[PDB]
Amino acid sequence: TSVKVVTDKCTYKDNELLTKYSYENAVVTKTASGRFDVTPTVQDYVFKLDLKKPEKLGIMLIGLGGNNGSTLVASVLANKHNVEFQTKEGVKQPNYFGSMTQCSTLKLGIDAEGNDVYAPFNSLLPMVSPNDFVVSGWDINNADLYEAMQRSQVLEYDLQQRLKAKMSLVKPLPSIYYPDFIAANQDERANNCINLDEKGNVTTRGKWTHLQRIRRDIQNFKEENALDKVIVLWTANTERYVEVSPGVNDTMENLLQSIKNDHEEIAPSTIFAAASILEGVPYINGSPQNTFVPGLVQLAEHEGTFIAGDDLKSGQTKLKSVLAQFLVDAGIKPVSIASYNHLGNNDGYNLSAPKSVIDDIIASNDILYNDKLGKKVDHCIVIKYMKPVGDSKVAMDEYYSELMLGGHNRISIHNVCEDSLLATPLIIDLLVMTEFCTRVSYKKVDPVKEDAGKFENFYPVLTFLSYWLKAPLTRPGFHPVNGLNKQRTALENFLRLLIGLPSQNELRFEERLL
């Protein structure tokens, strides 16, 4: 399945794709008089898409032995080998449900009877299939992917048994472990580390050597498997936030120096990220950690390496975003939002250890939210640990909106699902989109000089992945976009413009006019 657009904006050459595009926008300036001044903005571009996708993509997850890690590898094997499995409801076939890049579709246009015609998200342009993912990684635990899969209690027993043979062969490489960055209760799982002293005890000494190790591990993995492309995705337990101290991790030279001196400010995630950047490998942070300190970000810009991340954005977080937006777009003013969640996996255990979307929506509607009628919105996030629930997550949200004439509206949302079975599919999307973006270059074409300038690459921070990130990383200055649906459309239009197609207008003048 493929798509071909007949447009004079797209041309080929040496197995590549060149396309012109006029980026239209507009700058605004509010007048104290209460008048908006909009001045349209135009900027022609020329995008180059590397039409040669890797025959096999290399994926290295930090926390391979975890729920997502094991589930990911499992999904890849089951799907690639069509490993059907027995279930209480009969024999089921493997699939990537939950993956918008694998099971979603986009509207290309209309047909004869002016009806909308859709095509798979990955049919517009060549993208790497997860079935071609060569997965490996690190993890402070030596349990093979079969054992790791059993303790995760995520997949059917039968499916696990049919994958047992293969899974048992995959062992996660030893990793870096600095106790002062996670739950004090990890000393038992931590039995697969590279940072061990002469005797054999965990040590935060020799961080630079650790970085050297991860670098080598990347190289070896890429060598053992005739691979050219590799992607590092952090899916390990959450680390504690790190202090951004000046003269330590604020600039490039400092960061690397800090590591060499084993500065306390350097977390293991910091080392993994740095090692990935130094190897030209795109690093993706799927955890709530300020891993990308100004130092690393600077190093990324320099090396021209890709970095994206900060929390995988759960499926429930996506709902809260949609619901909230919906209400406010309809003129409904939510006054209170209660979100109480609780699960029982090793993830929610690390959280409970004894030792903003809503904000943007408010600033967008000064009608409902202002000093005269109120500019605040109560919201609380709760996450309790309940082991006797398993990976099955229970999400509960309560929206109390203010309606016309003293009226009120209360919406109760009860979400229940196998937490890992949502994140995994999502992680696949990030991987798929990351490598795709790697094969994309752009040139800011001006009107006065022909062929002026060479092709550049996407800004180090792939904001185009904010759809799968709870805390979208943004370059100094710009404000992150949290509008889920808007992030979804951004992708559509992006893929569209690449094949010579304008933005969706939904004006359907074919029907409304004539």
Added chain:
Amino acid sequence: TSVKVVTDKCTYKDNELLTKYSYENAVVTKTASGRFDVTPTVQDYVFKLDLKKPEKLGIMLIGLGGNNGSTLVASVLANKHNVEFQTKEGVKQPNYFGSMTQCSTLKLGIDAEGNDVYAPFNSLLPMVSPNDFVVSGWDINNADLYEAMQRSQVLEYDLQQRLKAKMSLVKPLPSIYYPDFIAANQDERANNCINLDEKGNVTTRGKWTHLQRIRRDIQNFKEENALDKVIVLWTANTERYVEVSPGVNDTMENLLQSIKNDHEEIAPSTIFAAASILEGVPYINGSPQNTFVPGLVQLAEHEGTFIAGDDLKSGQTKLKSVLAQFLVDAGIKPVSIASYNHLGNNDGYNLSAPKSVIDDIIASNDILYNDKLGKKVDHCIVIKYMKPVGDSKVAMDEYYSELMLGGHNRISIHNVCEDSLLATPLIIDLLVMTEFCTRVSYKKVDPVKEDAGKFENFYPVLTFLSYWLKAPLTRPGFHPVNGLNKQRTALENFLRLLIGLPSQNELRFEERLL
């Protein structure tokens, strides 16, 4: 609060706005080899907006003495005269929360810093304020609008008392009551009928005179209030679906005669609609009735009168269109959708006497729904009647979806609110937007012959209002568009294009690139 855009596509003259716009789309063809051939299409237009908005807008509601009717008149007066009222929470100020046209916002562009900039939905172009609404109408019950509130039990007691003086002076004109079109017999509540024989009893005879009677009321209302524009909206109890037959109510001329012949296939709504069309007055159907039979449609096309409607989109039904779209757009395949509603309005007793979105979503993604994994989605809607709940309706939805590897996701939606407080604000939007389209005319540009033909009005059926309509009617052959968000965006780009602004793309190339 106004908006001024700097563009050479907009020129003002004679208090009118002329805007050039290039409409881009694309036809698609599917090849046996599973390939989509996209053929881009372009069509330049020239829209003309009548900047002269009515100083006062005439609104005539059928069933003006009901929940929505009484509540609507209340909101207008409360907001127009700033009638604050006492509540359990204290003194409150009236507003139009729930009204997207009155309390929502739109993105105009970005500011210097690079942040987004929003403006009220009705700030781009001049629109009629509900504060300038002159409401009147018909109803089979003579009770004045004050008594209407008391029995409706929708607004705060205090507010009702502060509006008692004014409300009690508003009385609904006698309406047409064919007991054969309403499930429950209402001859006692119907003490305000026009169709009475010499014995003073209700009869379905002389339907033509009934039609003239209505046309007379439309004429009287317009003169007694010195009004120009007038809009009729149906908010009366649901009628039974009429039958479509050749020579009867299929052709324009057939309908007219079928009326003079007092045919059994002519409902009072059919009459009200026809009368509205015969007066060049736009008619809207806020009820689930095939009132716009092919006869009336053609009737409208001839008269050049705007029509649209068929059931008012409720609040819960919107959450459905949102959630459902959300999931499938995320690659999640829903398989079970069960909705259960129940309230206690007067209409709740009418729906107690017996005589889609999910579809468009299934056809959009053939990856999840095909002849191999399942192309069906069990959906059921059960609306009971619980008088001991007042205007407060309780809705509950249960979405059961299949996840990756035999996974599952169960989402429960519990919505509670005073139904009429959601519909009223919605009705206001229909009226505010309808009168707008009345001041809009376009001209399909001919590349060969300039100034070819003259400005035309929208196709009688205003699908642009399908955002507020549950079962939007369309042109013969065309498929309905229920995507809530897609309908919303349609309105955006429509307003944006009239001021010389391109459709939103959310590409934000100022951050992603450079």
Added chain:
Amino acid sequence: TSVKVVTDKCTYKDNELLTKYSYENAVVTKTASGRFDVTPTVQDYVFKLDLKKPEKLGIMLIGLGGNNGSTLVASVLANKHNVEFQTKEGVKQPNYFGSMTQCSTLKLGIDAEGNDVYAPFNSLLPMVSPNDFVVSGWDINNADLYEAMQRSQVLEYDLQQRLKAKMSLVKPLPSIYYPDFIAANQDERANNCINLDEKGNVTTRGKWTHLQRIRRDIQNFKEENALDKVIVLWTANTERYVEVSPGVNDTMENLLQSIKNDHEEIAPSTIFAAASILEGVPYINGSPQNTFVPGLVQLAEHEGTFIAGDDLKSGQTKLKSVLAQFLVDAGIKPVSIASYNHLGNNDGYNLSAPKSVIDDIIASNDILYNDKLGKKVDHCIVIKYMKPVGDSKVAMDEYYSELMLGGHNRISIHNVCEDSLLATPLIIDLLVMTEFCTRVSYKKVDPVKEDAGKFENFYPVLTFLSYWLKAPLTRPGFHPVNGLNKQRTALENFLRLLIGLPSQNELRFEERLL
């Protein structure tokens, strides 16, 4: 509406009720072989019930100006003076719904056909009517009760208005305010204190003079009105648990001395209690405070003054107890019970600052809970403050039970209501019952000696009220019962035995046999 029972166990003389009763029970001892040895038990008694109920019961509430305090006085005036009020749903008559003692019924037996016959809970024996309640009390805030209502936002605006005249006449007496005993600082809300130094500021010194003063308040209140009987109920914000030391709290003589020494361990509640006990007036602690320390208890024993309470039981807590017991009573094993609640009352502050029934069920079933299958049950209660909710409280419980053959059951509860409208009704019961027990004296019957012993009143600590207390303090040694239903039956039987009626045994041999 009284109940006459023909019995040789009940004798009415000199306006008093003498009833005989044989208390049957059983002692048990476990055997090594797992065999249970039950040894029956019997003990004859003779109860004397003072049939002279007060014409007017005196109630003094500590925290009169609070939500419950204001609502209680209001409920009394509304019902007493039949103050009907207007509401969004028409005129409504005042009642005591939520009060089992005032609105529940009991089974007296069968009839001719053999059908169950019920009678109001307060018709078997003479009980005080809340309509005869003369209320007064203390509060650190001087706002009159009318202003108290507006601040509580609990009752309908109209009702508050119709009670404005009478409510404005009620003002709470100055109370004792020790700032170091309240979580949230309240120096701005506190303007009605007695503990003021000569200069005129709040001080914790001179606690004994403070007690003397409160004694005066009780004496005056009693003299002021023609009251002989008076009860004190604490409904003020929660204090901090005062640690118990062997030199101050330990005994009666110490407590009194400690008070004279202004010991930091003497809280204002401690004083109010002592003051109440010293006046022969029963004290009820309606908050989670170890007010009743050993010292106080002993004092109550010496003076023979009744005391009881320790945190008012919530409708939320009551419900959790019912389901919990229900599930276990059906052989179902609940493994996880999550509870999340949030409100916006003033107490929300005292429940937010920088300051089990489940266990009994588990221990009552070694079949479901044991060292072989599991003896634990994850439970957790979360309470959040959400001002934009008013008096309304949103409770959510999540029970995850275990079924057979790997089965599982999930029950999601969602309770919503005005927190104070359920509590107020409960406080009334406590008062009604507390005064009832006051007129109850018993005498143990010695089979070998006639008329042996005198009639003794209930043990200072009233447990028959546990139905309304979450943390019912029990005499040293015994274990507190938390099974709601059982507490209900305890009351049923007690009232029945008093009128000569057997225990309740649903055995219907008049149907099951013969």
